[PDB]
Amino acid sequence: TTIFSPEGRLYQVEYALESISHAGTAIGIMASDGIVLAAERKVTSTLLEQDTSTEKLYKLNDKIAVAVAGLTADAEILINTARIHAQNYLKTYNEDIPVEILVRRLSDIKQGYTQHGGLRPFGVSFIYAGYDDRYGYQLYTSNPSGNYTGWKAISVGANTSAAQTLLQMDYKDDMKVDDAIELALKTLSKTTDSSALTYDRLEFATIRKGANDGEVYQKIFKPQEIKDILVKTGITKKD
Amino acid sequence: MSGYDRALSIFSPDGHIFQVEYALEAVKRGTCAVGVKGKNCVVLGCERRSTLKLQDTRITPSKVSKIDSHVVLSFSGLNADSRILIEKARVEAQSHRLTLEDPVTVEYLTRYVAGVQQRYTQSGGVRPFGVSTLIAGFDPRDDEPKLYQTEPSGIYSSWSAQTIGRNSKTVREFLEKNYDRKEPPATVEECVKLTVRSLLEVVQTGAKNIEITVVKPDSDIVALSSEEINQYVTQIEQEKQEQQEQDKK
Amino acid sequence: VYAINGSKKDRFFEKLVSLAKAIETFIHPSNNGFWTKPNAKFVHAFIKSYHGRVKYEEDICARGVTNGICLTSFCHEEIVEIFLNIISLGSQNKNPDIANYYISCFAYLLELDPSNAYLIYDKILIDLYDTLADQFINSRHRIISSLKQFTRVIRFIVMDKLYRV
Amino acid sequence: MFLTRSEYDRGVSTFSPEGRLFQVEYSLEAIKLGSTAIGIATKEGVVLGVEKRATSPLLESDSIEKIVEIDRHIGCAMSGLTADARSMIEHARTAAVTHNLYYDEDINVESLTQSVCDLALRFGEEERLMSRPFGVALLIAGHDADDGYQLFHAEPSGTFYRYNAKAIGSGSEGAQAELLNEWHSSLTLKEAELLVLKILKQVMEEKLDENNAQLSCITKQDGFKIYDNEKTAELIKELKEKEAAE
Amino acid sequence: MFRNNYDGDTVTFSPTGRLFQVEYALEAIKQGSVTVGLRSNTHAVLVALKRNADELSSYQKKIIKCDEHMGLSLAGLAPDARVLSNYLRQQCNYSSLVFNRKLAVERAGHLLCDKAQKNTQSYGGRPYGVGLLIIGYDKSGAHLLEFQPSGNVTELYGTAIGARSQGAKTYLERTLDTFIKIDGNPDELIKAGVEAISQSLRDESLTVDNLSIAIVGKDTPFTIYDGEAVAKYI
Amino acid sequence: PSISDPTTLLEAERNDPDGLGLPLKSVPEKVDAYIKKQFEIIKNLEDSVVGLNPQQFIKTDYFYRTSTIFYWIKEMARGPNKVLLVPYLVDYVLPFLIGLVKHKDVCALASLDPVRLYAGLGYMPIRKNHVAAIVDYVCSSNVALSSNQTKLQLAFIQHFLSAEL
């Protein structure tokens, strides 16, 4: 009902934070030449359509992606608002939206749903990723409170604490995107509740530069490409 | 309105234990923010919590926020709220000039901010902001430094030095001993040195945690870098060794 | 409860009338707060424990002799005189589990067979006729607490030749 | 102590069995908890004065001025300052200027007092009714051509009286008793100043001086002015010799 | 000890059909100072005792004017008596602009009833805490209406409202033929009210400042008396 | 107390005929004289503050002493130390606290609360011996008290009598 606890703390935000603390794990890592996003997906359903095109990971425009921990129903309302804002910026300025302007845009909407008592807050945590000329490769996180922070590597959702410790000891400022592929897969295999990692339990993506000077490219990996980085990395659930 | 004053035991009216008191509790839990005037500058300073090893420093927001070319705002309490409170003040100031051929006055940037905070107190099951602020700068065509504090209730006041957030008693105690209102710090360097001494008593580890913005007349706004505040911290720590070794026994 | 000398009682009962006078305002139904659960349980435990003392020493008396530290009729009378208003105020409480502690005291006060027992029956008839005649129709706690009070004492109203009519 | 609670306490927009609105009544009891403010009306000026709590040296005075100008002929004393007190005063300022530019003349003090009470009946800004309180006690003082020097106690209820003399804040009983025992229709402005200082001395606990007390008056000739610390000091010196002269 | 479940909201009915909040709104009339209203065939009169909170304090206003032909007294809630009296003056002006009559006081009664009954029927407000005596004169003669805030009204030769008014009411009732005939000598209709209101003063006394008198009949329009205007009537 | 023998403790507690024993804890005689000397230093330093305003009162040795003894009393009045303070009440601590109450702006410049502290001292565990001396002290009329001090003495007598029902 958006009233303070006597400590000056918001009960609804704390309960929304309890909800996302169950909501599946996501890791993001910022290499010297690209960003990696990975998310672990609890497929307890055989008849759920794996090889559906998205669940945890989404495009916001041609150079920005997100991972979702939380309610996917809540996330998709924010994701569409961010997509509309990215194209409305591109229409106005003829230029691609800077990552800080969009990440904090979704952090200002999520704060409003925490102040007015007719609205429940959004049960979603986002690990944003992208490139722009103002900064370069940027990795941000945002949570049900409307707080947002810049990171070199971060986890959200379940098992955050184990994942942050594993990131901290292996992360290097000068590492390449293929080292961040390896690291994010290792971290998730060293954090997972499921017995071993496999291509349908895993959502993956990258924000590389490629060979051509003007390019930045956002491969949100199809299952067969994820099977290749799995067998190359030594996670290798292979015949 | 609190404690041991109780007629025929007691019972509560509509009154003190209220949403705005719990917003004041949120403000006290947010990092320490300080401001001191000088002869012809004002310096605002903040506590960063010591950044985590995987946090990205080059994109991390400067805690002290420029509202306009001559006005600076810092806060303690809820960050998300301060971001929503700085946006309203920034557009309010840009709109001021567009409709008044006049940059916003520091006192109008303090009455507006505390004013909007007061409306979220008044009614509606919309909560007050868990935020308290320092608003500092200069008016246009003047050389007088200004420094205001605002509180979640929408009360505001002018100070020649003030502190808000965590541990602010101990800082206000140090300022009352080191800030003389007859002879304030006569130079920017001394004003910055006083804020670094003031913060050094309350910050977690040292030069990492302090960050300062200096405002001067005619829109000369200037954040100090880590390397500049490291030479202030080092000079103050040199004078501590010098004072200790200048013991006579 | 085990302080009372049944032959020198007057200075003990003088402290119990002044204890009850001190706490009487903390019992009243518009005065809820941290003291409500303390008071309701103290009143119940004192009356239960005094009735446990009375019926322990009545059993020694039945097969032997009376010591004169044993309580007299005058002591059960004094106990009803001290606690009758307390049990009346506490049975009208907003919390129905708090109200049940005071309503449960009436049975112990009637089982002492005091000379004062008419004070307890008269109160419960007045309120029960006032509920069933719809005199309390705006006050659902008087409806329910009077039905709760009457239910506790039917077994004692049934035995007395006047109230059984 | 013994508890004395009713079932009608804490009722919002509700009458007790007597008709008592207990939110606006419990708001009227806060005229004992504030810092002391006193007003004295006369045929020569309305003398307003407030006890200062001693500030941190870092808090600069203009932050806490509890005597205020509404307009050149009207000023407020407050026993306590809140955002709502500045809201009442800035509504009074905006009301006084909007009156002067619409009606080409200065606002009557009764009509300003009624306009700040209408703000209180609205609860700021559906039928405007007196159900809940707003803000704090104002002593509004002023001078106009039609009803002269006037002191109004404007209450959180949206109602008021004109008083000849009124005290609010923690001296209320002992002050109002000494005011009603002592006030004349023959008070000169000088004697109204010594009278407010004699009353202030008696409540304040401290030794009265130009750093714990504040004076002002509305005069028709000079307008509203807050007094210089040197002027309250020479008045306080004059009080000392007036009682030493006994 | 005797909690009422059905007096929280203006919209609740008691199991016996009472609107308890509205009956509590009547008990607010008993919180005011006494006012007396009375009429002859050609004049209606109001006389009102005014309180103060302290000897330094200006006495409370009790009689209000809506138009040259009618006005009212208020023993109940003063700030809520400004809401009804504003609305009555607004309706007098509406009648002169939109219908070019002036609002006959029976019609004024019907409009106050409508406004008060609306408060009595809808959630998110309170009953009016004020009783009004309205006095007026029009084509149907000298008129006196007791408005009670439940949303009701009655045509009456006289009545008293406020604390201790059963005394003054019983004097009007024992001295009715005395005031109903008076007509062309309006000062004895004023002295009839001053005897009536004097019965509610329990060795309190009338004073030049404590008392206000208002009269409206035939050509002489609605007028109010204060200070020495009421000294010849002490 | 560190008594040499269990039987010496038992004899020493049986020696008071009222059947309430000695205090559980007590100040050794040199520590007792150190505590009393801090208040006598304050009483001799009173001459150094007779003329001056709060802003320079805050800069005096008398105030630095007073502010320290306030924090000492206030910490002694929590937790397991209240009994250590009841011997100093009528001779030093209560006289000191009504002394501080005259300096209401000094208690605003420094965040002191003599009122809340002194009123709260009425709830301490006071022995039967000390009740009579507390009563004779608070029942002493001195015309030297201002209204704030006399209504504080009534406030104490309010939280004292209610805590001595």
From Swiss-Prot, chain A:
Keywords: Cytoplasm, Isopeptide bond, Nucleus, Proteasome, Ubl conjugation. GO terms for cellular component: cytosol; nucleus; proteasome complex; proteasome core complex, alpha-subunit complex; proteasome storage granule. Gene3D superfamilies: Glutamine Phosphoribosylpyrophosphate, subunit 1, domain 1. Its main location: cytoplasm. Transmembrane segments: none annotated. InterPro entries: Ntn_hydrolases_N, Proteasome_alpha, Proteasome_alpha-type, Proteasome_asu_N, Proteasome_bsu_CS, Proteasome_sua/b. Pfam families: Proteasome (PF00227), Proteasome_A_N (PF10584). It is found in: Cytoplasm; Nucleus. GO terms for biological process: proteasomal ubiquitin-independent protein catabolic process; proteasome core complex assembly; proteasome-mediated ubiquitin-dependent protein catabolic process. CDD domains: proteasome_alpha_type_4. There is a cross-link at residues 91, 190, 222 (Glycyl lysine isopeptide (Lys-Gly) (interchain with G-Cter in ubiquitin)). It comes from the Eukaryota. Signal peptide: none annotated. Belongs to the peptidase T1A family. The 26S proteasome consists of a 20S proteasome core and two 19S regulatory subunits. The 20S proteasome core is composed of 28 subunits that are arranged in four stacked rings, resulting in a barrel-shaped structure. The two end rings are each formed by seven alpha subunits, and the two central rings are each formed by seven beta subunits. The catalytic chamber with the active sites is on the inside of the barrel. Present with 17100 molecules/cell in log phase SD medium. This is Proteasome subunit alpha type-3.
From Swiss-Prot, chain B:
Keywords: Cytoplasm, Nucleus, Phosphoprotein, Proteasome. Residues 237-248 have a biased composition (Basic and acidic residues). CDD domains: proteasome_alpha_type_7. PROSITE patterns: PROTEASOME_ALPHA_1, PROTEASOME_ALPHA_2. It is found in: Cytoplasm; Nucleus. SMART domains: Proteasome_A_N (SM00948). This is Proteasome subunit alpha type-4. The gene is PRE6.
Curated annotation (Swiss-Prot), chain E:
SUPFAM superfamilies: N-terminal nucleophile aminohydrolases (Ntn hydrolases). Keywords: Cytoplasm, Isopeptide bond, Nucleus, Phosphoprotein, Proteasome, Ubl conjugation. The modification Phosphoserine is found at residue 14. Pfam families: Proteasome, Proteasome_A_N. It comes from the Eukaryota. It is found in: Cytoplasm; Nucleus. The keyword Iron does not apply. There is a cross-link at residue 191 (Glycyl lysine isopeptide (Lys-Gly) (interchain with G-Cter in ubiquitin)). PANTHER family: PROTEASOME SUBUNIT ALPHA/BETA. Belongs to the peptidase T1A family. Present with 7210 molecules/cell in log phase SD medium. The proteasome degrades poly-ubiquitinated proteins in the cytoplasm and in the nucleus. It is essential for the regulated turnover of proteins and for the removal of misfolded proteins. The proteasome is a multicatalytic proteinase complex that is characterized by its ability to cleave peptides with Arg, Phe, Tyr, Leu, and Glu adjacent to the leaving group at neutral or slightly basic pH. It has an ATP-dependent proteolytic activity. This is Proteasome subunit alpha type-6. It comes from Saccharomyces cerevisiae (strain ATCC 204508 / S288c). The lineage of its organism: Eukaryota, Fungi, Dikarya, Ascomycota, Saccharomycotina. The gene is PRE5.
UniProtKB/Swiss-Prot annotation, chain F:
It is found in: Nucleus; Cytoplasm. This is Proteasome activator BLM10. According to PubMed:12973301, colocalizes with nascent proteasome. According to PubMed:15778719, associates with proteasome core particles and also forms a complex with regulatory particle-core particle (RP-CP). It comes from the Eukaryota. Present with 2600 molecules/cell in log phase SD medium. It comes from Saccharomyces cerevisiae (strain ATCC 204508 / S288c) (Baker's yeast). The bromodomain-like (BRDL) region specifically recognizes and binds acetylated histones. The YYX motif is required for the association with the proteasome. Signal peptide: none annotated. Associated component of the proteasome that specifically recognizes acetylated histones and promotes ATP- and ubiquitin-independent degradation of core histones during DNA damage response. Recognizes and binds acetylated histones via its bromodomain-like (BRDL) region and activates the proteasome by opening the gated channel for substrate entry. Binds to the core proteasome via its C-terminus, which occupies the same binding sites as the proteasomal ATPases, opening the closed structure of the proteasome via an active gating mechanism. Transmembrane segments: none annotated. Belongs to the BLM10 family. HEAT repeats lie at residues 88-127. The gene is BLM10.
